[PDB]
Ligand binder design. Structure first.
Ligand SMILES: CCCCCCCCCCCCCCCCCC(=O)OC[C@H](CO[C@@H]1O[C@H](CO[C@H]2O[C@H](CO)[C@H](O)[C@H](O)[C@H]2O)[C@H](O)[C@H](O)[C@H]1O)OC(=O)CCCCCCCCCCCCCCCCC
Ligand code: CLA
Ligand code: CLA
Ligand code: CLA
Ligand SMILES: CC(C)=CCC/C(C)=C/CC/C(C)=C\CC/C(C)=C/CC/C(C)=C/CC/C(C)=C/CC/C(C)=C/CC/C(C)=C\CC/C(C)=C/CC1=CC(=O)C(C)=C(C)C1=O
Ligand SMILES: CCCCCCCCCCCCCCCCCC(=O)OC[C@H](CO[C@@H]1O[C@H](CO)[C@H](O)[C@H](O)[C@H]1O)OC(=O)CCCCCCCCCCCCCCCCC
Ligand SMILES: CCCCCCCCCCCCCCCCCC(=O)OC[C@H](CO[C@@H]1O[C@H](CO)[C@H](O)[C@H](O)[C@H]1O)OC(=O)CCCCCCCCCCCCCCCCC
Ligand SMILES: CCCCCCCCCCCCCCCC(=O)OC[C@H](CO[C@@H]1O[C@H](CS(=O)(=O)O)[C@@H](O)[C@H](O)[C@H]1O)OC(=O)CCCCCCCCCCCCCCC
Ligand SMILES: CCCCCCCCCCCCCCCC(=O)OC[C@H](CO[C@@H]1O[C@H](CS(=O)(=O)O)[C@@H](O)[C@H](O)[C@H]1O)OC(=O)CCCCCCCCCCCCCCC
Ligand code: HEC
Ligand SMILES: CC1=C(/C=C/C(C)=C/C=C/C(C)=C/C=C/C=C(C)/C=C/C=C(C)/C=C/C2=C(C)CCCC2(C)C)C(C)(C)CCC1
Ligand code: OEY
Ligand SMILES: [Cl-]
Ligand SMILES: [Cl-]
Lengths: 244, 97, 50, 137, 33, 30, 51, 334, 36, 32
């Protein structure tokens, strides 16, 4: 028994990943030979934390909590990729495709909006060696790519862009442009992020697994205009395994 | 020290030939027999170290290898430019007519 | 950079009797992510206008 | 300026033979083109795939060459992709697919020639406008 | 915002001088009847 | 300072509204 | 070419380039002219002069 | 003497300084809700992501606007025509980002304005008046429904109803022209005729009465003191006004019946503005102004441009620039 | 939020019923001439 | 000189407001 679109539509359940029975404490074993894919990886964030900028030299700022303002638009889903068995029995997941990004803006205390591209683009995530079974103590660790939040065609409010748009501040024709280079010259950032996936529930019959994830990445730098913030994303995940 | 990478890219062979590593897929219509089929393939299998690497695309029929040879002089390869390949922009870069 | 360096005159009389936080999530103790309810600096000010 | 035989004269085939349309044929093809084609090809663009237009230089580089009556009449019967590699009668109006594209049903053979003639003549009249898009409106 | 400083004085006088003129004529009108 | 000026003027208009309605010259017949 | 004559050939002294609420002297806009930089000549890679 | 009856008598009393009435019972709370939220939002609302593309537009004074640039920004295109009350948001911070205040303000105002029209009927009845002033007012009211409700309904989003600000108004009318060619639409042309003609006849009527005032005063005093509120005799000579204006044009193009004349004053701008409200209301369903682009061509078939084609070059510049990051496909179909 | 929602439903309902019952209360008769 | 530019508006109103007060009281005196 499962739900249909018309049962889901407008509930918010569309933004929630599938869950596993609290009874599902099994194990899914790995034939060193036979090959495996992940047919659906789903990541549902629950918490967004931003690193403060502590002004001084030895205070190291806190991760503070934020209010989401972009509503139930946050989840990655339909992600798929190879799941490899390495020489030493570690498993490596290689993301291929899926809805693997969501723009998000959270709001810090005091009103500052922080946008970010919550993503796992190009994720490669490995386990410990000598796995031989996925269990309620398997941990995946890996890193991914975080492209620029806007892509190259994006025009700022004065028409300036990277692959399109004006190359100067046309409203200030005889102004000195040195002050304005950072805002006139757009840059396409490309950074890396890190993620931990902790498996806590495992259906040995069906190959489904689920658990918790923590991700660290950078926020939007507005095409070079300003410095990014560090973001920590916590939530829950769900993945399904198939022999390839 | 702040450069526009796309403008900088127009000063390379990318500004004069089809860059097999960067150029949007609609450029493969300027020369015959290349679109959509070979173009689909060149893009999917990018990036290339040299122009002549496209002949080693698996699955190529001898007729296909013949069109690519016919057109190698219209291709180049420069370094992959993140800003031209992210966002699926090699398949749709937002330009229509 | 506490309030008394920024020429705040009435802010400390609100703080004195218990009004410590803002509808925008900050408190003058520096604690982030606080919900003061109605009796924030904002609502105190609103109530005097009304 | 006027609609002279030299403008109404277009390639018949790739050999290099020519045919001179009549004013009638030209206006016949324009009308038929609005009836069966302009919904997607108004002004020589392709609203549903703007990367392919009806300019003569684009048609010339299609496989097989389509800058002539024979190629265009053929395309209206058995349309292919630009490289000739796959037949696309299932998604492009054609006599081959007049069952799913009912407007092609009452097109005769001489209608096809009038339409191909219009497509080849209009660029000679309108220039860059034909297939150029809104920039040239 | 980087705004014209004299805008303030200009606005105040623009309001104050014409307004004060009307009040002067109103009050001395009421004191007649 | 611009914000305060804009709102100050807007506030004076609202006050003026109040007096023009409740403290008007009351029209008197003939 | 005397600088004075070159300075006339500059749209910033065109009176039809101002604004109603752009106040003050012309110098408050483009600044106080200090020097003629020279007459700029553009050429392409083929050495054609360009305008 | 009963409690409900005494309430009903106070609601409908002709002795309150401002009439309340049953329509008033709904108008007052809704106009206050809309007004108060408007004032606070205009001064202090943070930026709003009108077009649903995570590109917030700042509309309030404290976020760097002046009186001319400020606005309550329309709600997000992500919401479309969905109802977005405060209690549907996870928080006020979310509601502010997505533009909740706009919906609150417009729905309360349209309700309260509708009751304003009803109130005009109602007091007319209590005072023994004829009833149709409210019909005059339906013309402006209709106009407000068109830009805040009907056009959003036809286009699928409140992001496309008119901003509540001066520069946002201009944005809305430029984009309308690009997409609908409103200038070339006859119903808009009748609006201009109703508005220009209204201003003309306003000036005419005011200058004719003013020209024919009967001498009742000295050079040293306002002529206005020649009329005393509630006097029974007329204060001007209409036969003199008729005699001047009839000769200015010709006799039979001038009114000597003051009832006909005043009805004519009422009908011309009311009807013109009904039509212009109808213009917005039907262009909401994309039945746009006349299109004569390339209608004139020569013997060969060259396009011979007209002023319509020049207008089209302008419309095109508006088209291609508006909401410059929000279109991913070649046709802007809504 | 749920408390806000209840409150508004209550406030609105109240005003709408004042309106409905106000006009049901013999509105034709509240004019200066003929009462019935 | 790098003066306080709020000094101008302070001085201007320091003068205008109380002067206007006086003028208003005087003129309505002369008119009765
Ligand atoms: C002319 C004559 C006419 C008659 C005159 C009538 C006189 C009455 C005039 C009314 C004046 C209204 C004043 C405006 C009120 C708006 C206050 C607001 O919205 O303020 C509400 C505050 C604001 O909330 C805070 O609002 C903040 C909003 O932030 C924003 O605001 C910040 C502060 O500016 C910064 O700008 C920040 O960057 C920006 O994001 C945060 O989101 C906080 O988390 C959030 O708590 O909330 C609170 O706690 C409020 C309590 C809600 C708690 C939940 C219980 C629900 C209670 C239901 C309410 C009942 C309503 C009464 C009707 C009953 C009828 C019998
Ligand atoms: C013909 C009159 C005239 C002209 C052409 C000039 C021209 C000039 N003056 Mg001079 N000036 C004049 C009169 C004039 N001045 C007078 C009478 C004074 C005394 C107040 C001054 C005091 C003065 C000073 C102190 C300075 C100048 C400066 C300047 C220069 C800048 C002007 C500027 O920014 O404009 C600004 C113009 C406007 C913003 C337009 C304002 C018009 C408003 C909008 C009209 C109001 C509309 C009204 C309310 C409508 C309501 C009607 C309805 C209700 C019925 C320029 C060469 C400046 C300069 O550079 O000198 C070194 C400078 O600093 N002038
Ligand atoms: C005559 C009084 C009146 C009326 C007609 C409205 C009407 C409205 N209010 Mg407002 N409102 C009012 C008084 C009123 N309000 C007052 C006095 C307050 C302050 C307490 C509010 C505070 C308020 C808020 C905070 C919000 C509204 C909203 C709304 C809308 C939805 C209401 C709803 O779901 O009702 C449902 C209930 C019924 C239809 C009852 C039917 C009963 C019959 C038997 C609607 C336009 C919401 C809105 O505009 O969202 C866009 C919103 O967010 N109102
Ligand atoms: C000479 C040039 C010219 C002229 C004369 C007009 C004239 C007009 N245009 Mg066109 N327009 C023009 C050029 C022109 N336009 C151009 C160049 C463009 C394209 C850029 C347009 C685009 C255009 C659009 C897109 C629209 C118009 C509309 C209109 C009408 C606006 C007035 C109106 O709607 O009244 C109607 C009356 C009102 C809107 C008033 C409603 C008032 C409510 C009921 C009450 C308000 C209460 C208030 C908030 C509080 C007051 C209380 C107080 C105490 C504060 C009018 C017929 C509008 C129209 O037809 O509207 C239907 C419209 O939407 N025009
Ligand atoms: C080479 C050679 C020699 C060539 C030969 C050329 C040759 C020599 C030519 C020479 C020509 C010649 C010698 C001259 C004769 C030419 C001639 C007769 C030409 C006609 C000229 C012409 C263009 C005239 C313009 C006509 C015109 C524009 C008028 C139209 C009037 C009009 C539409 C008005 C609207 C009126 C309206 C609808 C209602 C009234 C308005 C209004 C409601 C007012 C309010 C109001 C009204 C009242 O009424 C009263 C009472 C009161 C109270 C009041 O409130
Ligand atoms: C009696 C006193 C009350 C009268 C004053 C009332 C206030 C009204 C002030 C209105 C002027 C607004 C000026 C704003 C600009 C300002 O602040 O900058 C102040 C500007 C001067 O500009 C200043 O100049 C400085 C160096 O000189 C720097 O450039 C500063 O940056 C610049 O602000 O003032 C003016 O230029 C003063 C004279 C302007 C007179 C020319 C007007 C000619 C137009 C005639 C058209 C008349 C139209 C009538 C229509 C009916
Ligand atoms: C009402 C009509 C207005 C009447 C005339 C108004 C002018 C009156 C004089 C105003 C104060 C003059 C201050 C100089 C101007 C100045 O720059 O101030 C401007 C300063 C504001 O200070 C500004 O602050 C800014 C950052 O916020 C920047 O730092 C600016 O540089 C700084 O100027 O005004 C004050 O700080 C507010 C005044 C409140 C003073 C209360 C303390 C006084 C109490 C003692 C009074 C005793 C009276 C004894 C008499 C018997
Ligand atoms: C701790 C909170 C305690 C709250 C205590 C309760 C306070 C009660 C508040 C009510 C005070 C209202 C006084 C009105 C006096 C009066 O008018 O006397 C006038 C006379 C007496 O009464 C009237 O004429 C009755 C009609 C009242 C008209 C209502 C006006 C509302 C119109 C809406 C305005 C729209 C927006 C305006 C924008 C500029
Ligand atoms: C083949 C096509 C078919 C035909 C066309 C079909 C469509 C017809 C539509 C019009 C229908 C006719 C009704 C009009 C007559 C009427 O109003 O009479 C009522 C009054 C009475 O007149 C007065 O009449 C009075 C006597 S009595 O009432 O008529 O008995 C008299 O006292 C007084 O002096 C005299 O002036 O007429 C006048 O007062 C003149 C005013 C004209 C009002 C027209 C409104 C214009 C709005 C246009 C909007 C433009 C905006 C842009
Ligand atoms: C939309 C429903 C269309 C209608 C109606 C017609 N055509 Fe079309 N055409 C359409 C598409 C999407 C494409 C591209 C097909 C592809 O993937 O290659 C085309 C292509 C053509 C071409 C080839 C152009 C070229 O540059 O090689 C021609 C000559 C052509 N179409 C002609 C044509 C005629 C004559 C039509 C009416 C009878 C007609 N098309 C209708 C979409 C649509
Ligand atoms: C100058 C000076 C001085 C003095 C000062 C003063 C004295 C001040 C005052 C001031 C003040 C004293 C202020 C006030 C303000 C107020 C306000 C700001 C208010 C507002 C209100 C409102 C807005 C309301 C509204 C309403 C109504 C009316 C009804 C209903 C309800 C409501 C609420 C809505 C000194 C000595 C220090 C010295 C220095 C200088
Ligand atoms: O005109 Mn152009 O169309 Ca009616 O939507 Mn499509 O773009 Mn956008 O949101 Mn406002 O605006
Ligand atoms: Cl726009
Ligand atoms: Cl789109």
């Amino acid at each position: 028994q499962t739900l249909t679109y018309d049962d889901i539509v407008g509930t918010g359940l569309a933004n929630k990943c599938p869950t596993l029975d609290d009874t599902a404490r099994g194990a899914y074993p790995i034939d060193s030979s036979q090959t495996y894919r992940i047919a659906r990886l789903c990541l549902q964030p629950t918490t967004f934390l931003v690193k403060e900028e502590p002004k001084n030299k030895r205070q190291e700022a806190e991760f503070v909590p934020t209010k989401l303002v972009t509503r139930e638009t946050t989840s990655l889903d339909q992600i798929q990729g190879e799941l490899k068995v390495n020489s030493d029995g570690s498993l490596t997941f290689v993301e291929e495709d899926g809805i693997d990004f969501q723009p998000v803006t959270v709001q810090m205390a005091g009103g500052e909006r922080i946008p970010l591209l919550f993503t796992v683009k190009n994720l490669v995530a490995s386990t410990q060696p000598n796995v031989t079974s996925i269990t309620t103590s398997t941990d995946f660790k890996g890193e991914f790519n975080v492209p620029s939040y806007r892509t190259a065609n994006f025009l700022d409010p004065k028409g300036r862009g990277l692959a399109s748009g004006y190359d100067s501040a046309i409203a200030l024709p005889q102004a000195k442009e040195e002050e304005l280079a950072r805002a006139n010259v757009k840059r396409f950032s490309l950074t890396k992020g890190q993620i931990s996936l902790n498996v806590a529930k495992v259906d040995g019959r069906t190959g489904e697994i689920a658990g918790t994830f923590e991700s660290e990445q950078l926020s939007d730098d507005d095409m070079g205009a300003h410095e990014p913030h560090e973001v920590k994303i916590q939530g829950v995940f769900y993945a399904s395994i198939e022999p390839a | 020290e702040l450069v526009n990478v796309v403008d900088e890219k127009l000063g390379t062979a990318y500004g004069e030939k089809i860059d097999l590593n960067n150029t949007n897929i609609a450029a493969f219509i300027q020369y015959r027999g290349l679109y959509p089929t070979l173009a689909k393939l060149i893009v999917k299998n990018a990036p290339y170290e040299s122009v002549e690497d496209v002949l080693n695309i698996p699955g190529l029929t001898e007729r296909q290898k013949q069109i690519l040879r016919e057109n190698l002089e219209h291709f180049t390869v420069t370094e992959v430019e993140t800003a031209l390949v992210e966002g699926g922009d090699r398949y749709n870069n937002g330009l229509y007519k | 950079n506490p309030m008394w360096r920024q020429g705040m005159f009435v802010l400390p009389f609100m703080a004195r009797l218990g009004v410590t936080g803002s509808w925008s999530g900050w408190s003058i103790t520096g604690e982030t992510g606080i919900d003061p309810g109605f009796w924030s600096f904002e609502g105190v000010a609103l109530a005097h206008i009304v | 300026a006027e609609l002279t035989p030299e403008v109404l004269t277009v390639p018949l085939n790739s050999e290099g033979k020519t045919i001179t349309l009549t004013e009638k044929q030209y206006l016949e093809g324009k009308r038929l083109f609005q009836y069966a084609c302009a919904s997607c090809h108004v002004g020589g663009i392709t609203k549903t795939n703007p990367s392919l237009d009806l300019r003569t230089e684009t048609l010339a580089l299609a496989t097989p060459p389509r800058d002539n009556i024979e190629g265009l009449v053929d395309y209206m019967k058995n349309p292919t992709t630009y490289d000739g590699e796959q037949e696309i009668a299932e998604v492009h109006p054609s006599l081959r697919s007049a069952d799913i594209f009912p407007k092609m049903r009452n097109l005769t053979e001489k209608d096809l020639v009038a339409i191909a003639g219009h497509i080849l003549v209009e660029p000679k009249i309108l220039g860059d406008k034909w297939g150029g898009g809104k920039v040239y409106y | 915002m980087e705004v014209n400083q004299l805008g303030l004085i200009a606005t105040a006088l623009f309001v104050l001088v014409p307004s004060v003129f009307l009040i002067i004529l109103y009050v001395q009108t009421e004191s007649q009847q | 300072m611009e914000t305060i000026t804009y709102v100050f003027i807007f506030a004076c208009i609202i006050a003026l509204f109040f007096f023009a309605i409740f403290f008007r010259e009351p029209p008197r017949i003939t | 070419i005397p600088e004075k004559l070159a300075f006339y050939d500059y749209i910033g002294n065109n009176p039809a380039k101002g604004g109603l609420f752009r106040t003050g002297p012309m110098n408050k806009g483009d600044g106080i002219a200090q020097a003629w930089k020279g007459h700029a000549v553009f050429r392409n890679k083929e050495g054609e002069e360009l305008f | 003497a009963n409690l409900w009856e005494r309430f009903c008598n106070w609601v409908t009393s002709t002795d309150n300084r401002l009439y309340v009435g049953w329509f008033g019972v709904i108008m007052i709370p809704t106009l206050l809700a809309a007004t108060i939220c408007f004032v606070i939002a205009f001064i202090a609302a943070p930026p709003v992501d009108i077009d649903g593309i995570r590109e917030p537009v700042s509309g309030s004074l404290l976020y760097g606007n002046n009186i001319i640039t400020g606005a309550v920004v329309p709600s997000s295109n992500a919401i479309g025509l969905h109802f977005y009350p405060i209690w549907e948001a996870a928080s006020l911070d979310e509601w502010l980002y997505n533009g909740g205040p706009y919906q609150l303000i417009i729905f309360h105002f349209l309700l309260g304005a509708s009751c304003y029209m009803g109130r005009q009927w109602e007091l007319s009845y209590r005072l023994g008046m004829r009833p149709w002033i409210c019909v005059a007012y339906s013309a402006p009211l209709a106009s407000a429904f068109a830009v805040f409700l009907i056009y959003p309904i036809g286009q699928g989003s409140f992001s496309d109803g008119m901003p509540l600000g001066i520069s946002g108004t201009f944005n809305f009318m430029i984009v309308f022209q690009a997409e609908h060619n409103i200038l070339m639409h006859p119903f808009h042309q009748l609006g201009v005729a109703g508005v220009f003609g209204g201003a003309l006849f306003c000036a005419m009527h005011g200058s004719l009465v003013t020209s024919s005032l009967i001498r009742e005063t000295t050079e040293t005093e306002s002529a206005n003191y020649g009329y005393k509120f509630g006097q029974e005799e007329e204060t001007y000579n209409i036969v003199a006004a008729h005699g001047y204006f009839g000769r200015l044009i010709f006799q039979y193009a001038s009114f000597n019946n003051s009832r006909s004349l005043h009805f004519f004053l009422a009908a011309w701008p009311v009807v013109g503005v009904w039509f212009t409200a109808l213009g917005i209301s039907t262009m909401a369903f994309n039945l746009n102004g006349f299109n004569f682009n390339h209608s004139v061509i020569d013997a060969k078939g060259n396009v011979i441009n007209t002023w319509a084609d020049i207008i089209n070059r302008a419309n095109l510049g508006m088209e291609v620039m508006h909401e410059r990051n929000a279109h991913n496909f070649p046709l802007d179909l809504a | 939020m749920e408390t806000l929602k209840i409150t508004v439903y209550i406030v609105v309902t109240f005003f709408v019923l004042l309106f409905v019952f106000g006009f049901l209360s013999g509105d034709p008769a509240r004019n200066p001439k003929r009462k019935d």
